[PDB]
Structures are given as structure tokens and as C-alpha cells.
Amino acid sequence: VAFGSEDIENTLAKMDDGQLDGLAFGAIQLDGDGNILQYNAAQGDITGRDPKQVIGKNFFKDVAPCTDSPEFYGKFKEGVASGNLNTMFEYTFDYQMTPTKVKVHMKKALSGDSYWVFVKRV
Ligand SMILES: *C(=O)/C=C/c1ccc(O)cc1
């Protein structure tokens, strides 16, 4: 499955604990509040987080405070409220990591109650 595919969430809805680690891009699944439900191996390779340790933490408050901004978290919240989260943008991640330019794709999951954040280096 390629980053930014039109129906990426269809493919990832099918994936368990293992298949998500084989993606070529970082993949985080969040609930509506930003709590981390899933976090794959490719994302940990970019950020220096242990995927097994971040589960349950809040992405915007605790893990990724540089994303607590209108440009990221504001766009996330707008999408969980509208029910149609689907946006791609560039961003820099720099909290307890080497400042790293990325491309982000946020997309509602098929559950309707969980939201994907996809990341790749640029
Ligand atoms: C800014 O503080 C970004 C930090 C960050 C982004 C994504 C992650 O999975 C971990 C940390």
C-alpha cells in the first residue's frame, strides 16, 4: 500500500499487529482525543519512540508536542468533528528527535471512531 493512496484506510483496516509493521511509511492510529491506539515500526524508526511504549499515551499532549498547533492538531480536531478527516501537509518533527522534515497524511479510519496519522520523510 503506498503512502497517500486514495483508499489507504481500506487496506489498513484489514491489517493486524504485524502487517502494520511492514508498511513503507509511519502509521499511527488515534482515537478522537488523540490517544494512541496503534504505532508501527516505520514510525518508531523516524521518531526514536519505542512503538510498544507509546501506546495509550496522548499524541498531542505527551508524545508530539510540536504537533499541538492549528496546523496539525487543529486540523485533526476539525476532521474528527466533521467526520471527513483527509488532509496531507508537510511538517517538521523536533521533540526529542533530530529535527526531521516529513509529509503527513491524516485520514479517518473505516471504524468511524479512530483516525490515522501517516508519516514519511521528505
Ligand atoms: C513534535 O514534537 C513531533 C514529535 C513526534 C511526532 C511523531 C511521533 O510519532 C513522535 C514524536
Side-chain angles (χ1 to χ4, degrees):
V1 244
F3 178 95
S5 298
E6 4 212 320
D7 63 339
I8 188 65
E9 75 273 19
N10 272 29
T11 299
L12 266 64
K14 301 180 207 169
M15 299 195 155
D16 78 338
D17 51 319
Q19 324 175 266
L20 207 79
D21 292 342
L23 295 164
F25 53 88
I28 304 168
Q29 199 188 26
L30 302 179
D31 66 14
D33 298 328
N35 302 306
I36 299 171
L37 306 179
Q38 296 181 68
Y39 195 100
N40 76 346
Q43 183 67 7
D45 291 346
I46 297 171
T47 65
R49 276 55 178 185
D50 176 3
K52 323 250 191 186
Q53 175 191 307
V54 292
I55 305 301
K57 296 190 177 175
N58 186 279
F59 181 80
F60 298 109
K61 176 181 174 163
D62 311 305
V63 179
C66 73
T67 73
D68 181 359
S69 69
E71 295 73 27
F72 195 135
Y73 182 33
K75 283 186 169 172
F76 172 87
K77 128 257 246 243
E78 290 161 355
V80 344
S82 68
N84 189 191
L85 181 63
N86 181 11
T87 177
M88 289 193 23
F89 51 93
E90 281 183 32
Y91 211 82
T92 299
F93 290 166
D94 60 358
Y95 182 64
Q96 300 183 167
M97 58 184 282
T98 303
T100 301
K101 240 268 262 255
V102 297
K103 195 110 80 157
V104 182
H105 178 205
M106 284 190 297
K107 184 91 171 258
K108 160 191 247 189
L110 295 201
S111 52
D113 44 72
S114 82
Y115 310 89
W116 293 103
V117 180
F118 301 126
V119 176
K120 63 175 189 170
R121 293 174 196 260
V122 303

